[PDB]
């Protein structure tokens, strides 16, 4: 079977810059059966390039492809705002198809540290027997961020989940939530709830915390 | 005027079978390549199998061929995928799309038509509407709503019936170890507005016919 790899995993570039995306096959593939697809969140994929270098109908001229054998590239010669998306290469042999893992092209803006907020569980939720503690990291760039939960200085591992928004279309930042879940009983047995945030924009980690019962 | 329309969202128990349809209008199945491509949440595209109308042949990914059947109905211009022995690994959006290239002496031919996708959720969970809890609030304050313990996807959230959009971040849901989803929606606002402006999140979980308007009030030490 053909196996496809893609690099880089994420490409961070600014509008107007030239993006070069790489696709590599495990064995020589027919140039007639090497294609590139764009995909944006919530949408189906869209064909950009087929036959390694042919531009699909309606695709802007800044998209091109080249290559042969095992190595292929997609070039976006001058990124437009609408070009920030995920890009997949696709190959086939005897109508057996394989997608590469995708390269995300995100918008490179100036580094922005997150603003951090911590939310205690509501009294309404506590009456149901469960406590959710939410830490919000708002409007930061780049996407990479680390959140650490501590309850009375005990590191919490395995009992939180994170979610990240898609890059904002106006300010090109990300936001992230981390939610720590405890039983009501465990929550009421401890005092200090802390969210520690590490990010390249921050010279030192930021901790937001509350004491259970404080106003 | 070519349109590929797929059947609606599906919820299936582990071990069940799902059948998704892809109906072509404005074109003919015997002239088209129709392939099934799925995408697990937050993951990449994965080819499953498909149909080539020119040669009237079906193709399968070896990973699935023991439990996947593709069916072409050239009389109704409809292609089907039937996937059995489902597990939670099969929760994904399933797309039909025209992947095949025609190699002739005159050059390469390819179409790019896609259906809208079909969400298939594989889970033992029962339908359940969310509980909505407040995330209560320098010059900028943050507030939000925690939309906890619902099944299946999706949920929508607005603020002040759509009047408040700037600064809103509604996060993608996470799947909890309980098999129920949870998400939060937050907004940042001027802290000087907290005593004046009402903030209400409007939560709609259509699978359970659950609508909730939750007012979120600030916390004070005064």
Author numbering:
A (entry chain L): 1 to 27, 27A, 28 to 214
B (entry chain H): 1 to 52, 52A, 53 to 82, 82A, 82B, 82C, 83 to 100, 100A, ...
Question: What do the study's own words say?
Answer:
RSV F initially folds into a metastable prefusion conformation, with fusion peptides buried within the central cavity of the trimer. Antigenic site Ø is located at the membrane-distal apex of the trimer and includes the α4-helix and the loop connecting α4 to α5 (α4–α5 loop) of F1, and the F2 loop between β2 and α1.
To investigate the conformation of site Ø and define the epitope on prefusion RSV F recognized by AM22, we determined the crystal structure of the AM22 Fab alone and in complex with the prefusion-stabilized RSV F variant DS-Cav1. The AM22 variable domain (Fv) superimposes very well between the bound and unbound crystal structures, with high structural similarity across the framework and complementarity-determining regions (CDRs) resulting in an r.m.s.d. of ~0.31 Å for 214 Cα atoms. The AM22 antigen-binding fragment (Fab) has an ~50-fold higher affinity for subtype A with an equilibrium dissociation constant (KD) of 0.12 nM, whereas its affinity for subtype B is 6.1 nM.
